[PDB]
Amino acid sequence: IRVFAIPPSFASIFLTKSTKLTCLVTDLTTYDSVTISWTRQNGEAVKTHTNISESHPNATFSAVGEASICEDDWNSGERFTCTVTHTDLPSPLKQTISRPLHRPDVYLLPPAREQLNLRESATITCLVTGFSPADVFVQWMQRGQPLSPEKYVTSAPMPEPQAPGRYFAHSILTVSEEEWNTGETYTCVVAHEALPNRVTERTVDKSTGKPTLYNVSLVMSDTAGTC
Amino acid sequence: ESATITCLVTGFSPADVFVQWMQRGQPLSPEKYVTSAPMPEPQAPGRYFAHSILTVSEEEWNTGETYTCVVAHEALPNRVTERTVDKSTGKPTLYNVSLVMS
Amino acid sequence: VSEEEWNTGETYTCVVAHEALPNRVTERTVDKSTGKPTLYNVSLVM
Amino acid sequence: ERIVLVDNKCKCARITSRIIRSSEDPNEDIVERNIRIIVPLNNRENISDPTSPLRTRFVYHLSDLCKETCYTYDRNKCYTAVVPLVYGGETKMVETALTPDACYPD
Ligand SMILES: *[C@@H]1O[C@H](CO)[C@@H](O[C@@H]2O[C@H](CO)[C@@H](O)[C@H](O)[C@H]2NC(C)=O)[C@H](O)[C@H]1NC(C)=O
Ligand SMILES: *[C@@H]1O[C@H](CO)[C@@H](O)[C@H](O)[C@H]1NC(C)=O
Ligand SMILES: *[C@@H]1O[C@H](CO)[C@@H](O)[C@H](O)[C@H]1NC(C)=O
Ligand SMILES: *[C@@H]1O[C@H](CO)[C@@H](O)[C@H](O)[C@H]1NC(C)=O
Question: In b/e form, how buried is each residue of C7-42, taking b as 16+ CB within 10 angstroms?
Fold first, then answer.
C-alpha cells in the first residue's frame, strides 16, 4: 500500500498528446478491481485501472488511477487530490499535488576533431541551457525521420550554478563517424513552455561549421544596379 | 553573454569519474563548474559518460586562456588525463583573400 | 621520432611527476598545427 | 555542389559553403565559404534619393545579412523617386524611373 502521487511530464504532453493524473499505489493486497478515486476541485474522478497489475509473483499490486483527459486540463493547473478506499486500511490516504520564465537557449555544438581522428564514432550534443523549470522535451531529427529512443540518451536536467532559477540539460547523439561525414543535416528539435512555436529547430552538419579556408572575393565593379 | 565549455568524457566502466577545471595552471573553485552524474551509453552498456560544464565570461574567453579540463579515473594509464583548448585551438584557418579592380 | 611521423601529426603528450603539482601530474600537447597562426594570402588581380 | 546559404540582393552577398572531397584517408578535408560580394563603387548612400553624395564607407555585417538602407539596386524591384517639373508658374511632381529594365511596362 504505497502512498504516491505522480504527475505527468511536459515532455509527455507533446510526445503522446495525452495526460494522466494518477495516484500511484503499489504493493497493495491481492484484491482485484480496487476502488481508487483521484478527484480534483471540480469533482471528476479518474476511470478504473485497466491493463494493469492483478497478480504478480513479487506481490506488487500496482493500482494506478490512469485516465485519458485533455492535455490543456493540467495546463490550467487545477488542484488534484487522491482518495483511497481500501478494505485493509479503513483510513483513506490523502495527498494533493500542485504546480507553481526564461527563453530556452537550446544551442548546438559540433563534434570534436579528436572524434574524427580516432575514427571510432562521433558525438553531437544539444546544449539545452537557460530554461526553467526542468520540464523539457529533447528529440533528434535526421533524414526527416525521428530517431529511435535507443540511439540517443537525454540526461536529467540539473541546476545551473550561474542562474539558480534556470536549468540546463544535455543530450548526446552517438553515431558512426562515417555517417557524420556524409550530409544528414543532424537536425535538433526541442520543446519548452516559454517558447513561441513550442518548437525551436536547430541544425548542425558538415556543411556548416568552422571552415578551413576563407576566400572573400570582391570586384571593384563599375557596372552597378545589376545584382 | 558568456562562454560555456563542455567537457565530454566517455568510456569509464567503473562509473566513478572525477573532473576538475584548471585555469592558468591553477585549480578553480568548485562553484563555477558542475559535473553531471554518470549514466551508461546505449552503444556500450559497460561504459559510462559524464559531462562537466563551465560557464565563464565571453570577454575572458576572447583573451588567450587555457581553461584546462582534467579527468581522474582508475582505468587511465596515469590515472589523470588533462585536455586543453583555446580561442585558436582549432585548425589554422587558412585565408584565400582576393580583391579585384576590374 | 622519425621526420615523416611528425608530418602525420600525432599528439605526443608529455607528462611529469612531482609532489608540488596540485594534480601531481600535468600534460602538454605539441603538433604540426601548434604554430602557423592564421596565415593569409591576398591576390590583387586587375 | 555548393549550398547557397544566404543570397542578399542589396548587399549583393553570396553566402555559400563548399567542401573539397579528400582522398582515401582520415578526414582532414577542407571546408570553405565561397562568399563573393560585389560593390557598386558609384552608388549613393540613400539609394532612393538621387541627390545624395557618393558613399565611401560600405559596412558589410555578414551575420546581419543572414537574417538598414541597402547598397545596390535590384532589377526585380523598383527604386523610384519623385522629381518636380515646371512648364511655367505651376509646379508638378512626377514620379521618375531611376533605373531601366526594372520598372519597364511589362
Ligand atoms: C532616404 O531614405 C529614407 C529611409 O531611411 C527614405 O525617406 C522616406 O522614405 C519613405 C519610403 O520610401 C517615403 O514614403 C518618405 O516620403 C521618405 N521621406 C521623405 C522625407 O521624403 C527615402 O528613401 C530617402 N529620403 C528621401 C527624402 O528621398
Ligand atoms: C574559392 O576556392 C575554391 C577552391 O578552393 C574555388 O573553386 C572558388 O572558385 C573560390 N572562390 C572564388 C570566388 O574564386
Ligand atoms: C585559393 O587557393 C586555390 C587552391 O586551393 C587557388 O586555386 C585559388 O586561385 C586561390 N584563390 C585566389 C588566389 O583568389
Ligand atoms: C593562396 O593560397 C592557396 C593555398 O595554398 C594557394 O593554393 C593559392 O594559389 C594562393 N593564391 C595566391 C594568389 O597566392
Answer: eeeeeeeeeeeeeeeebeebbeeeeeeeeeeeeeee
Strand A213-214, strand B94-95: pairing: parallel
Last-in-domain residue among A74, A100, A126: A100
Q: Which residue from B11, B2, B16, B32 is spatially nearest to B72, judged by alpha carbons?
A: B16
How far from A59 is each of A25, A62, A66, C12, D23, CA to CA, in Å? 13, 9, 20, 60, 63
CA C44 to chain centre: 33
Show the domain range for D25: 1-106
Experimentally determined by: cryo-EM
Task: Give the domain range for residue A135.
Answer: 101-227
From B93, B94, B96, B97, the mutation candidate for ligand 2 (largest count of ligand atoms within 8 A of CB) is B96
Q: Do B2 and A162 touch (CB under 8 A)?
A: yes
> Given the DSSP bridges, would you call strands B18-23 and B26-27 parallel, antiparallel or unpaired?
antiparallel
Question: For residue B10, what is the domain's CATH number?
Answer: 2.60.40.10
Using CB atoms within 10 Å of the CB of residue A148, give its burial: 0 to 12 exposed, 13 to 18 middle, 19+ buried: exposed
C-alpha cell of A83? Answer: 482518495
Is D15 within 8 Å of A215 (Cβ atoms)? no
Closest Cα partner for A45 from A24, A30, A67, A29?
A67
Total domain count, chain A = 2
Pick the residue from chain B with its C-alpha nearest to C39.
B94
Query: Would you call A212 an interface residue with chain D, using a CB distance cutoff of 8 Å?
Result: yes
Region of A10 please: left (phi>0), alpha (psi -120 to 50) or beta.
alpha
Question: How far apart are alpha carbons D71 and D9 in whole angstroms?
Answer: 9
CB A167 within 8 A of CB B36: no
- Selecting from A207, A218, A224 the residue whose C-beta is nearest the C-beta of D37 gives A218
For B51, which of A170, A210, A217 is closest by C-beta distance?
A: A170
CB atoms within 10 A of CB A169: 23
Q: How far apart are alpha carbons B27 and A90 in whole angstroms? A: 60
Look at the block and give the residue holding cell 583573451.
B63
Which residue is closest to C43 within chain B, CA to CA? B98
Residues in chain B: 102
